[PDB]
Tab-separated table of C-alpha atoms in Angstrom:
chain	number	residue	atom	x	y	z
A	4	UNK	CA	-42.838	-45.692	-25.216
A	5	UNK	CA	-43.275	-42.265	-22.918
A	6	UNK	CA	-40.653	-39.673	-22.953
A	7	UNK	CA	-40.665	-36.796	-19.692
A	8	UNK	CA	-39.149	-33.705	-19.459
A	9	UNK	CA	-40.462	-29.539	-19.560
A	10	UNK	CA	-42.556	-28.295	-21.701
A	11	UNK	CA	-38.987	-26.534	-23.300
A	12	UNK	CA	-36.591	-28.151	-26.057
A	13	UNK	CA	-33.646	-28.584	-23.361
A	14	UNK	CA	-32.185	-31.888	-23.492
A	15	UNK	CA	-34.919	-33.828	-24.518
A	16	UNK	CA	-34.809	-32.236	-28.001
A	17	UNK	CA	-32.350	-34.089	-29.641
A	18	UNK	CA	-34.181	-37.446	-28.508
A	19	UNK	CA	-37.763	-36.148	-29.602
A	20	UNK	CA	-35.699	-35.303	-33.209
A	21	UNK	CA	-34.182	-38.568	-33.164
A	22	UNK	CA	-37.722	-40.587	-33.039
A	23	UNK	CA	-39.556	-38.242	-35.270
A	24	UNK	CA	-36.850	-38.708	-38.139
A	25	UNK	CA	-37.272	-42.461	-37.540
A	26	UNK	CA	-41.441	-42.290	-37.583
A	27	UNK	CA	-41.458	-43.929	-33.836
A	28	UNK	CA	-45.002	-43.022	-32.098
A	29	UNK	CA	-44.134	-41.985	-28.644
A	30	UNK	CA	-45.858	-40.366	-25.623
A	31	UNK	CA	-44.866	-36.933	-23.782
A	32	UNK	CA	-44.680	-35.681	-20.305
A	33	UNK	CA	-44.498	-32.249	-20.710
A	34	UNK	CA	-44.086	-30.843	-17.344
A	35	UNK	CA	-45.207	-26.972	-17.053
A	36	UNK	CA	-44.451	-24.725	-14.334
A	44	UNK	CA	-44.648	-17.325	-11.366
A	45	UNK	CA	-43.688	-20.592	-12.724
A	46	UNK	CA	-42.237	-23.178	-10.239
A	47	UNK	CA	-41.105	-26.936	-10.167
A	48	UNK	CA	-44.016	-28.797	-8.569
A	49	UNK	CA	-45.734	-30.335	-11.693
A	50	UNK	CA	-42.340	-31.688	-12.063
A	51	UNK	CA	-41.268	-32.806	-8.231
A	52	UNK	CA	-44.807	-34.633	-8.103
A	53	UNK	CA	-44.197	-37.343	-10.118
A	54	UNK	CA	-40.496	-36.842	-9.542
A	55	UNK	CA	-39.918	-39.678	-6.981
A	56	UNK	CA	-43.060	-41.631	-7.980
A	57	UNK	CA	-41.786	-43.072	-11.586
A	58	UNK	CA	-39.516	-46.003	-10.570
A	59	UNK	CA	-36.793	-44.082	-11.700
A	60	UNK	CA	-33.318	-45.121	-10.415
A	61	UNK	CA	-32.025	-41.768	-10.688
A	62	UNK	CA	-34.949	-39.428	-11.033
A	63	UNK	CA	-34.283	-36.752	-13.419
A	64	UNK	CA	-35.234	-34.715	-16.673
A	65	UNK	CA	-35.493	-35.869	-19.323
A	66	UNK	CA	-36.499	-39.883	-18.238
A	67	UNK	CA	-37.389	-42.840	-20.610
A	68	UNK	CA	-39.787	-45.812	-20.333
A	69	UNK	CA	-39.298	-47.874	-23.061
A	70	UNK	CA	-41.694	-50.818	-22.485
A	71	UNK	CA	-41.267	-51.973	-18.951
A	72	UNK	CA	-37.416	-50.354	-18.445
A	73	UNK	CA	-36.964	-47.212	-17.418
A	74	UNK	CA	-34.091	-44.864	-17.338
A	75	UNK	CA	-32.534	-40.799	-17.015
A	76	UNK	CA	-29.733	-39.088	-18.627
A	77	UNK	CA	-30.256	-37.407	-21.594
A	78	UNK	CA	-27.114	-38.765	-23.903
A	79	UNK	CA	-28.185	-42.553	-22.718
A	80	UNK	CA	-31.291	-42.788	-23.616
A	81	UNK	CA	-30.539	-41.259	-27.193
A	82	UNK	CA	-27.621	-43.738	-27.977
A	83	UNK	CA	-29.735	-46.382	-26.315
A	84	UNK	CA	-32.792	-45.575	-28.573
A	85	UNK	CA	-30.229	-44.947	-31.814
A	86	UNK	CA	-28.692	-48.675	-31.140
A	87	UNK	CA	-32.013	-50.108	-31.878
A	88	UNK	CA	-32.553	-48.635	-34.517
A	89	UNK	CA	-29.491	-48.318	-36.402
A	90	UNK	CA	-27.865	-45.109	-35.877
A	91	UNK	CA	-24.814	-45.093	-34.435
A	92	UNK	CA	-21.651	-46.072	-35.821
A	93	UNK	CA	-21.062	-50.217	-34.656
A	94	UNK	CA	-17.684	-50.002	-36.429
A	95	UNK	CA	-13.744	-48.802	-35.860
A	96	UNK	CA	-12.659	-45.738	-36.143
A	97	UNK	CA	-16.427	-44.185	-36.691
A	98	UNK	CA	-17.388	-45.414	-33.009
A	99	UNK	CA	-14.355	-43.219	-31.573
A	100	UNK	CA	-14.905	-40.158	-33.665
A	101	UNK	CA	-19.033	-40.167	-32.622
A	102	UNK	CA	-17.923	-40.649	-28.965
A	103	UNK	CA	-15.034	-38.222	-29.500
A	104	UNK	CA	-17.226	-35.420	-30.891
A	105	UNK	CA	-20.281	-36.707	-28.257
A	106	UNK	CA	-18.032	-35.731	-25.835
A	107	UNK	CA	-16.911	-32.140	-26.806
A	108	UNK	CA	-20.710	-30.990	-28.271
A	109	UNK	CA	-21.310	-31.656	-24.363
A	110	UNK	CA	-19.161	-29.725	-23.316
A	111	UNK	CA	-19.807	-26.543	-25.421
A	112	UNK	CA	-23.480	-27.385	-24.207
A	113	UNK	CA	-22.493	-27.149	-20.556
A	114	UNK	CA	-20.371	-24.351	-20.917
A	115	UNK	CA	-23.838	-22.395	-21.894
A	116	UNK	CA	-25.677	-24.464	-19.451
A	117	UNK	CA	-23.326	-23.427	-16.287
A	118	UNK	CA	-23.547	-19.786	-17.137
A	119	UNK	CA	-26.948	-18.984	-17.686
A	120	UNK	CA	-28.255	-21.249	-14.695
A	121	UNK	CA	-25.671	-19.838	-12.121
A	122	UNK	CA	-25.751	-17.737	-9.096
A	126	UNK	CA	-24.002	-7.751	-12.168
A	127	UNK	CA	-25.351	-7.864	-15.834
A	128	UNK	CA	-22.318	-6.437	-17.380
A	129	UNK	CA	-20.215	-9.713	-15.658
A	130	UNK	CA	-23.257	-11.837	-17.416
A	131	UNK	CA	-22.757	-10.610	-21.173
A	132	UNK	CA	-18.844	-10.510	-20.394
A	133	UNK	CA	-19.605	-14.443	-19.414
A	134	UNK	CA	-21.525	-14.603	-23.249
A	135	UNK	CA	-18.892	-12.961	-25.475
A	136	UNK	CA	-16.436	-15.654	-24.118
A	137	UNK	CA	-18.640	-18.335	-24.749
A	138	UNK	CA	-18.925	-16.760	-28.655
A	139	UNK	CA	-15.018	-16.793	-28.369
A	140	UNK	CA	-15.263	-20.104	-27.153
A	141	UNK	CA	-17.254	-21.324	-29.652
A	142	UNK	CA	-15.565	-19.588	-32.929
A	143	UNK	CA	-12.689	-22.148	-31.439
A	144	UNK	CA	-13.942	-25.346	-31.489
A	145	UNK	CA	-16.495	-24.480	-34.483
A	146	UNK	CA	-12.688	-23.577	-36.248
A	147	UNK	CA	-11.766	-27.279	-35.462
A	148	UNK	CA	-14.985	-29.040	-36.209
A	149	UNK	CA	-15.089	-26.872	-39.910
A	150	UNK	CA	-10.996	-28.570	-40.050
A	151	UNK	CA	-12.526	-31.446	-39.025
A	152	UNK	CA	-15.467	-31.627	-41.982
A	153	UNK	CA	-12.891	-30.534	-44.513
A	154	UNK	CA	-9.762	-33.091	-43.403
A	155	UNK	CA	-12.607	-36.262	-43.709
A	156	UNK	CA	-15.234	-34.554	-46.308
A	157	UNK	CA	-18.169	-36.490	-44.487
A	158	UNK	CA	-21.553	-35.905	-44.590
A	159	UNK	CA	-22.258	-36.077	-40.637
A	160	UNK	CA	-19.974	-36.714	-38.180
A	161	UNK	CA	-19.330	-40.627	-37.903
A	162	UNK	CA	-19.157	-39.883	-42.167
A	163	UNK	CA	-21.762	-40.684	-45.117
A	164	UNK	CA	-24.868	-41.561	-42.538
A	165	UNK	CA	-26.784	-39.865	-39.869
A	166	UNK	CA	-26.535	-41.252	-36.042
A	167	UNK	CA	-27.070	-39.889	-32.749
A	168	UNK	CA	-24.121	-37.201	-32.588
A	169	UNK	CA	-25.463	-35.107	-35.124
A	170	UNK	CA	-28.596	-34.621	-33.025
A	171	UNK	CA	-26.342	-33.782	-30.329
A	172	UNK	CA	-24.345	-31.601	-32.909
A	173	UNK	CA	-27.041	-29.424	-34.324
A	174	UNK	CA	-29.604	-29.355	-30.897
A	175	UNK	CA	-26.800	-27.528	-29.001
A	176	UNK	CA	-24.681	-25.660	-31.540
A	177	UNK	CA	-27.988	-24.067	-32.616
A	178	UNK	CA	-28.876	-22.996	-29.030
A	179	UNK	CA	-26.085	-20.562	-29.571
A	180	UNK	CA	-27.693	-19.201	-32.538
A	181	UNK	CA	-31.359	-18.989	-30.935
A	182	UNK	CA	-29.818	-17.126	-27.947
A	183	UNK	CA	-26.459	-16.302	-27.335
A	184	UNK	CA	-26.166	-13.767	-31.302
A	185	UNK	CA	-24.222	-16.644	-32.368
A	186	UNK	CA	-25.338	-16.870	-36.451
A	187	UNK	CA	-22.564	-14.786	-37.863
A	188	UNK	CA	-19.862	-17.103	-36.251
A	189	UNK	CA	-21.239	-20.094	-37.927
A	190	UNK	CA	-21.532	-18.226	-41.414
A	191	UNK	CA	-17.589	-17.563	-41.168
A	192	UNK	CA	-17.178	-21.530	-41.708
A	193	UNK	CA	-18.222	-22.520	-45.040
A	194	UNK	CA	-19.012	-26.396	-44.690
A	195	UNK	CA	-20.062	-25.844	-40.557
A	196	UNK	CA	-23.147	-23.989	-42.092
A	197	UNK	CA	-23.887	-26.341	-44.771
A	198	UNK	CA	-23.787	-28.942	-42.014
A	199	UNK	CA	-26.721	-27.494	-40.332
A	200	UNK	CA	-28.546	-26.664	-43.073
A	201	UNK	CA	-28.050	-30.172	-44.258
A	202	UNK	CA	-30.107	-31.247	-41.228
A	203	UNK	CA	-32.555	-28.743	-41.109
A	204	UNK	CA	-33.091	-29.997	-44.866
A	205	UNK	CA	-33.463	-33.730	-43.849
A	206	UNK	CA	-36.720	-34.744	-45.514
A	207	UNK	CA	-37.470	-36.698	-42.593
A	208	UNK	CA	-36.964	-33.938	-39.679
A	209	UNK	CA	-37.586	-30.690	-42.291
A	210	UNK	CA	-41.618	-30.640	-40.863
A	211	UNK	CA	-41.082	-31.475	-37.033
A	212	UNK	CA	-38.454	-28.683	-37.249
A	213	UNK	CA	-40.420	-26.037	-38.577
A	214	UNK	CA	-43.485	-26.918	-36.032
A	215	UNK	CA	-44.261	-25.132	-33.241
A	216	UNK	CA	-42.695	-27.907	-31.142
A	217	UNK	CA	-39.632	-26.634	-31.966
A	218	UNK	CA	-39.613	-22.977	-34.244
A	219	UNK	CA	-41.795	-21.323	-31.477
A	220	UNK	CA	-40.857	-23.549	-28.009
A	221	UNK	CA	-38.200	-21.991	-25.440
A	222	UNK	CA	-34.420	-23.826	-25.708
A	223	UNK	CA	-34.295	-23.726	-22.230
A	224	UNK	CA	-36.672	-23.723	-18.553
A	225	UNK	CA	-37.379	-19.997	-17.452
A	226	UNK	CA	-35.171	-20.431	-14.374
A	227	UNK	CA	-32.297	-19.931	-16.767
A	228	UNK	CA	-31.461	-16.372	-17.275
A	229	UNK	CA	-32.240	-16.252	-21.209
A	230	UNK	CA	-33.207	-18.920	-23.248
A	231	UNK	CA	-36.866	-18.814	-22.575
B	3	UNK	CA	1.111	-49.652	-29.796
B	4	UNK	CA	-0.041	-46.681	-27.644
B	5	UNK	CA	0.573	-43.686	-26.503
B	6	UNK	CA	-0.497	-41.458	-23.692
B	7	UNK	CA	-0.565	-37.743	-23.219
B	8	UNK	CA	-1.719	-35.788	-20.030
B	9	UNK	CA	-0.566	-33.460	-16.969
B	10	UNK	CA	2.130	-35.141	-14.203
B	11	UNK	CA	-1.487	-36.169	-12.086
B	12	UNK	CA	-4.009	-38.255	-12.059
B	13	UNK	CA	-6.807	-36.169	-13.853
B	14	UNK	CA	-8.781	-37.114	-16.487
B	15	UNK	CA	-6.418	-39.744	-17.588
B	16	UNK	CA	-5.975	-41.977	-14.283
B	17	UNK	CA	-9.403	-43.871	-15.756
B	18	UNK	CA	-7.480	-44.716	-19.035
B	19	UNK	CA	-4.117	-45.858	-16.670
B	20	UNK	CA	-6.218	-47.681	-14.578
B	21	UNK	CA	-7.893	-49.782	-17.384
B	22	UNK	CA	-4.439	-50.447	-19.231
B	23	UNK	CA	-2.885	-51.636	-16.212
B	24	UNK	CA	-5.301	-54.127	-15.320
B	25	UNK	CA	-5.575	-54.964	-19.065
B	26	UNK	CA	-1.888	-55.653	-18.768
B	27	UNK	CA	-1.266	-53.547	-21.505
B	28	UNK	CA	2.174	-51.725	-21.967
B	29	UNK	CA	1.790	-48.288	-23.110
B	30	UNK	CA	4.008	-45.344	-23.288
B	31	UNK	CA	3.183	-41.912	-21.264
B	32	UNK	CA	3.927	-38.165	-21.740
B	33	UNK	CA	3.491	-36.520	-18.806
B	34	UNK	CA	3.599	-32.856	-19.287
B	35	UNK	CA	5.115	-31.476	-15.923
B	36	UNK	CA	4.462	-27.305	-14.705
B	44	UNK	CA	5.707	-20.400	-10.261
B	45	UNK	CA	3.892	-22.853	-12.444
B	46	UNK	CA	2.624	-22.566	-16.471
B	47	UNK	CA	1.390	-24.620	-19.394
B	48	UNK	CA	4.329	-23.571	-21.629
B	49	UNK	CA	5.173	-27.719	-21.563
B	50	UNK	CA	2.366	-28.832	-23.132
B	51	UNK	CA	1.500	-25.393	-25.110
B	52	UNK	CA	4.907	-26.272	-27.383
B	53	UNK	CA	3.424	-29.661	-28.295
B	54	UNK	CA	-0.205	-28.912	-28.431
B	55	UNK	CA	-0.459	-28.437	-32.280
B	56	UNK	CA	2.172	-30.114	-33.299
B	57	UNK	CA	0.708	-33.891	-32.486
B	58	UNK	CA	-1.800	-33.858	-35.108
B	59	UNK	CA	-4.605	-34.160	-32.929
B	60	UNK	CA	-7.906	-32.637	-34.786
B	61	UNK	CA	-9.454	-31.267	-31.297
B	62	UNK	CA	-6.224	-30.732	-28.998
B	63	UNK	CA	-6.429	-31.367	-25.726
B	64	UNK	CA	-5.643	-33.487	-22.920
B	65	UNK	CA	-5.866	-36.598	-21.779
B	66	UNK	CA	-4.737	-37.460	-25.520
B	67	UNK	CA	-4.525	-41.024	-27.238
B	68	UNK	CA	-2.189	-42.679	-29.795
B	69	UNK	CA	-3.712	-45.864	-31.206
B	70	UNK	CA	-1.224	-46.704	-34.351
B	71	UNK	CA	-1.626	-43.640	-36.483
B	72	UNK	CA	-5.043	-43.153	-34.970
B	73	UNK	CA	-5.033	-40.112	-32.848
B	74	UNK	CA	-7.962	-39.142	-30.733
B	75	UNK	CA	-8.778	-36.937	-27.549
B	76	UNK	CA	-11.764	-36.948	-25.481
B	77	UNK	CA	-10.792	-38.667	-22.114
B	78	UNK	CA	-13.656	-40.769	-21.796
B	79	UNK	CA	-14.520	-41.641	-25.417
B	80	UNK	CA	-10.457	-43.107	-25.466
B	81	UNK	CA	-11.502	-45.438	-21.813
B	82	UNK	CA	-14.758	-46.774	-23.932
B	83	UNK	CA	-12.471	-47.252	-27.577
B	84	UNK	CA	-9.783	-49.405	-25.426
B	85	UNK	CA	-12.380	-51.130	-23.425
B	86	UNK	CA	-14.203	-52.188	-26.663
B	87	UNK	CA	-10.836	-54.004	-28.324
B	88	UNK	CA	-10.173	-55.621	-25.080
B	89	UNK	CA	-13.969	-56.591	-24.171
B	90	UNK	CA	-14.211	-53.819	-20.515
B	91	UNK	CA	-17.998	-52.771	-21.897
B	92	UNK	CA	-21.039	-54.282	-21.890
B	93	UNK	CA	-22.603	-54.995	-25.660
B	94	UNK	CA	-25.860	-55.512	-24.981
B	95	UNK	CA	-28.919	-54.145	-23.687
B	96	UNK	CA	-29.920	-53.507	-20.759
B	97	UNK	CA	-26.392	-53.808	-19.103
B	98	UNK	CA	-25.326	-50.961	-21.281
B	99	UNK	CA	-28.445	-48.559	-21.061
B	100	UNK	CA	-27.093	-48.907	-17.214
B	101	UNK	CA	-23.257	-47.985	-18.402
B	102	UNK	CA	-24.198	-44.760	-20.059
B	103	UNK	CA	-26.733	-43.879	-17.903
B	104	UNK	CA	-24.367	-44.169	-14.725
B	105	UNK	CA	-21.387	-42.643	-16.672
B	106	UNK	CA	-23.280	-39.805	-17.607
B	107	UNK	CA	-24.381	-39.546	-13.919
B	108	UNK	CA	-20.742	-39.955	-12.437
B	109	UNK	CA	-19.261	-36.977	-15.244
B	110	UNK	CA	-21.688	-34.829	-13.537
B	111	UNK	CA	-20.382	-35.566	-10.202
B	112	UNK	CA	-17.063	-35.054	-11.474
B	113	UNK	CA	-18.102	-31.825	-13.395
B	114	UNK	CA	-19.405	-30.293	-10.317
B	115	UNK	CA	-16.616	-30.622	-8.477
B	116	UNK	CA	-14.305	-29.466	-11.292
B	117	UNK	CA	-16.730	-26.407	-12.029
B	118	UNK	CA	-15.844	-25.389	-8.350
B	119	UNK	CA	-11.685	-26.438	-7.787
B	120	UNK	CA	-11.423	-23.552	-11.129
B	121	UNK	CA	-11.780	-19.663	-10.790
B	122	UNK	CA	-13.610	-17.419	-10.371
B	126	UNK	CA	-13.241	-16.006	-0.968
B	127	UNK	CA	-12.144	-18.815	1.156
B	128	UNK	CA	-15.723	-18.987	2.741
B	129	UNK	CA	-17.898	-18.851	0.352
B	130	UNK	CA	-15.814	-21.445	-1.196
B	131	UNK	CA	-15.311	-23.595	1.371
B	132	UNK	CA	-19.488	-23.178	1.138
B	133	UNK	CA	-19.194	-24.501	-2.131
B	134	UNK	CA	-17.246	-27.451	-1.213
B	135	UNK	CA	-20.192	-28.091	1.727
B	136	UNK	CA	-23.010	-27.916	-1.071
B	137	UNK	CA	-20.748	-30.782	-3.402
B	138	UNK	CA	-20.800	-33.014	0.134
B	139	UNK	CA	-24.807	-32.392	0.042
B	140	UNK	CA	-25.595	-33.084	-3.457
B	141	UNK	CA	-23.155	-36.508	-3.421
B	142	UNK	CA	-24.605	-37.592	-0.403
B	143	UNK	CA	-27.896	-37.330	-2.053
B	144	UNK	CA	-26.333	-38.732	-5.460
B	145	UNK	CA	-24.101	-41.626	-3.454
B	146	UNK	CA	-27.521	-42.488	-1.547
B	147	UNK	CA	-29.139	-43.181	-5.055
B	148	UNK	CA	-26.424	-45.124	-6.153
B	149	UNK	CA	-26.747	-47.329	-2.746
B	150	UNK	CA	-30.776	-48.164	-3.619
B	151	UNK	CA	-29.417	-49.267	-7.008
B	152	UNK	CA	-26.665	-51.816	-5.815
B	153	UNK	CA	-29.105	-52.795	-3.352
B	154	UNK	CA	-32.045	-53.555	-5.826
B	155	UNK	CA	-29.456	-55.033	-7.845
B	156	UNK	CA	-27.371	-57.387	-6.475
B	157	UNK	CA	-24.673	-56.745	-9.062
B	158	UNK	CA	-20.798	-57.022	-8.059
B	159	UNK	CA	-20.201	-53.938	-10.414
B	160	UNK	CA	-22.524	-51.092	-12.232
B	161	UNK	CA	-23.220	-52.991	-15.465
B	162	UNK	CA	-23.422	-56.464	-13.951
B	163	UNK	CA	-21.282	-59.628	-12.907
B	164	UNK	CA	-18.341	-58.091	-14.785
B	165	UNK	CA	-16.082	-54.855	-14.540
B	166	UNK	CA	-16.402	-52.514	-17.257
B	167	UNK	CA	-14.963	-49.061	-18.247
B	168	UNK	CA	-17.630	-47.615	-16.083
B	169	UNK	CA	-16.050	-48.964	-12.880
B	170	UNK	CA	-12.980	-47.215	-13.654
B	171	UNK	CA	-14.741	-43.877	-13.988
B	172	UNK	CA	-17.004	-44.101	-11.128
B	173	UNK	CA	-14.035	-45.399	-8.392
B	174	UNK	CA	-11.743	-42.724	-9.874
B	175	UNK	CA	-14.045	-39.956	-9.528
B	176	UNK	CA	-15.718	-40.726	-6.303
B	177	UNK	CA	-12.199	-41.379	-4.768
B	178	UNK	CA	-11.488	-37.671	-5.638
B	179	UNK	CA	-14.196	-36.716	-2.875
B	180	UNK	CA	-12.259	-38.155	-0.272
B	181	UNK	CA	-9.151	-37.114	-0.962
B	182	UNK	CA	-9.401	-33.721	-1.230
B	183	UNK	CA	-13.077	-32.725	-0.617
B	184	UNK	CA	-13.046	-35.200	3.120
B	185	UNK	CA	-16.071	-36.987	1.906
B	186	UNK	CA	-14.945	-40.315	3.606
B	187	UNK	CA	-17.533	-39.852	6.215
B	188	UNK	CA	-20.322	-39.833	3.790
B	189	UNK	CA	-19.080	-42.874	1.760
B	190	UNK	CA	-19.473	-44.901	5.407
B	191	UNK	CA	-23.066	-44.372	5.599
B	192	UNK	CA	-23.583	-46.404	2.184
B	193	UNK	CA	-22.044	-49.613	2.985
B	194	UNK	CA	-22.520	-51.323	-0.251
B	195	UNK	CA	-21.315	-47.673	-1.950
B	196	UNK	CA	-18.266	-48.308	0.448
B	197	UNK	CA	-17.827	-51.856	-0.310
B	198	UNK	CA	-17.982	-51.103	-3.782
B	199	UNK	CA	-14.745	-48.703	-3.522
B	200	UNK	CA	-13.126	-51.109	-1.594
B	201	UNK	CA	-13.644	-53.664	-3.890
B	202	UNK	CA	-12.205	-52.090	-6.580
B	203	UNK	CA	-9.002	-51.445	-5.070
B	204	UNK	CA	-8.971	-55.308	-4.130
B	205	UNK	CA	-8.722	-56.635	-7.587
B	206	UNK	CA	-5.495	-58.705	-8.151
B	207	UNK	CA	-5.074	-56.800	-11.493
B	208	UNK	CA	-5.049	-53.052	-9.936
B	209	UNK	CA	-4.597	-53.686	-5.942
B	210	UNK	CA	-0.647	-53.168	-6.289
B	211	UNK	CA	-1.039	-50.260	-8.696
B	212	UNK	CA	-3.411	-48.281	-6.580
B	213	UNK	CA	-1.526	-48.787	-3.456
B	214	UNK	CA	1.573	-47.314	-5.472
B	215	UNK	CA	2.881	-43.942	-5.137
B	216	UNK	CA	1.790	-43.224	-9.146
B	217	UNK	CA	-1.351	-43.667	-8.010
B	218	UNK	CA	-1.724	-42.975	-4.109
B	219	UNK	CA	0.918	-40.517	-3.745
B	220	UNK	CA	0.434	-38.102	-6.733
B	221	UNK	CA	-1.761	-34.932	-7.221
B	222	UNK	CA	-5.557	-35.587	-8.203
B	223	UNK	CA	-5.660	-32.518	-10.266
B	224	UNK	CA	-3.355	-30.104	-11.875
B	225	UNK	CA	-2.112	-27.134	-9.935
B	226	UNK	CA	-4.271	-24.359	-11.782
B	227	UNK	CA	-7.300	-26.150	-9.486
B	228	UNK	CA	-7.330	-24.332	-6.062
B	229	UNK	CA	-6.969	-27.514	-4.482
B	230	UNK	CA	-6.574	-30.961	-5.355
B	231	UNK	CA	-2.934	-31.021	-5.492
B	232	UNK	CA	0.385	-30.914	-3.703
């Protein structure tokens, strides 16, 4: 079981949570980098990979890319993910809209004046008070736990990876403190027993969020 | 009983049409029309219940969801369009995700913030899905599959034809899809199935806008 992607949290950080809460051994590529891509564009097309990309899975002899396939394909054998009606739809629902408040960040800091930059941040924090308004609406209209309700699955790796990229580097804390059951919800994962060590490791307290070729997050 | 919600064009929503209709499945449609402005779908937007507004949106019973393609993969679950089991889904997700980004791109460009260094933009999407569409010919060709996930069409067939058809529409891509003959077999394929051949050739589908007007092109 081998897992490849830069030496960063990035996307690969919600799968690396997702096997250390469920006490999987696995193996790391952790591609380094003035820093540069070749480490990376070495092995790139030298894997057996399909569609060659960051991060990339072999589990046993099959091998695959994309970030949110390999983590639902990973959480399916092992039990978490909702297998049931209407939990499925709100998991893929949610899925759906933590990626895009993920890419919204992504797309701006990997780009093509500085003053247009931070204008570009303060409407991703605008952005972001939104949909964390919904998702505190949404908490309080179901009273769940996680997301798909009273057990943890995939999405709330998603959920708490990307919102807390925000936090880490785009001055985002105080908008999460002005939702009372959003904040409990990340604290509540922070505080799982099983992830509460691998989170306060240097793996992931003192590693970058993102590569260096993104304008901050590194 | 269902109900679906989404701008007068094919958008994010043509996926979710697409499926129903070869499913068979009656459904009604709101489709919010447009100088041109939002102010259709603005008056409804919070008054539908919907816990993340936002369009395409689906009524399933009292269930109310949004997400365009988490509503294609909730349909296609009731009505057996996905595969469940392994590895014929690891290939689903993985080549959905891959075929959102292709999509993304594209919609990440047709949405503001001149006509060169746009039309530039449009000549690096044809680059990067010629490189994308040439991956996706190695994997039809290593597997000799009739469809992404296997002998049988899936949600993720609907997604990729959609998407990719998009490209030569608007973004005159049709070259590239000729180079890839079992990528261009594959599209032709799709619009060859007794269940969706009329539909497609129809002007709902054919002759109607790809994207909303607020893109800088992809419409009428």
């Amino acid at each position: 079981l081998k897992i490849g992607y830069w030496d960063v949290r990035g996307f690969a950080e919600p799968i690396r949570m997702l096997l250390k809460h469920l006490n999987i051994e696995f193996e790391e590529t952790r591609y380094g980098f003035l820093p540069n891509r070749d480490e990376w564009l070495a092995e790139k097309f030298t894997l057996g990979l399909e569609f060659p990309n960051l991060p990339y899975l072999f589990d046993g002899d099959f091998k695959m890319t994309e970030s949110v396939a390999i983590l639902k394909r990973l959480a399916r054998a092992n039990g978490m993910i909702a297998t049931t009606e209407p939990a499925l739809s709100y998991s893929e629902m949610i899925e759906a809209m933590i990626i895009d408040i993920r890419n919204r960040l992504i797309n701006v800091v990997y780009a093509e004046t500085p003053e247009e930059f931070e204008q570009k941040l303060a409407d991703l924090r605008e952005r972001l008070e939104t949909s964390l308004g919904q998702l505190e609406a949404f908490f309080q209209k179901h009273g769940s736990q996680w997301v798909a309700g009273d057990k943890l699955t995939y999405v709330d790796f998603l959920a708490y990876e990307y919102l807390d990229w925000y936090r880490v580097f785009v001055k985002s804390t105080p908008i999460f403190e002005k939702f009372a059951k959003v904040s409990d919800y990340m604290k509540r994962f922070e505080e799982l027993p099983s992830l509460k060590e691998y989170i306060a490791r240097d793996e992931h307290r003192s590693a970058s969020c993102l590569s260096p070729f993104a304008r901050i997050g590194h």
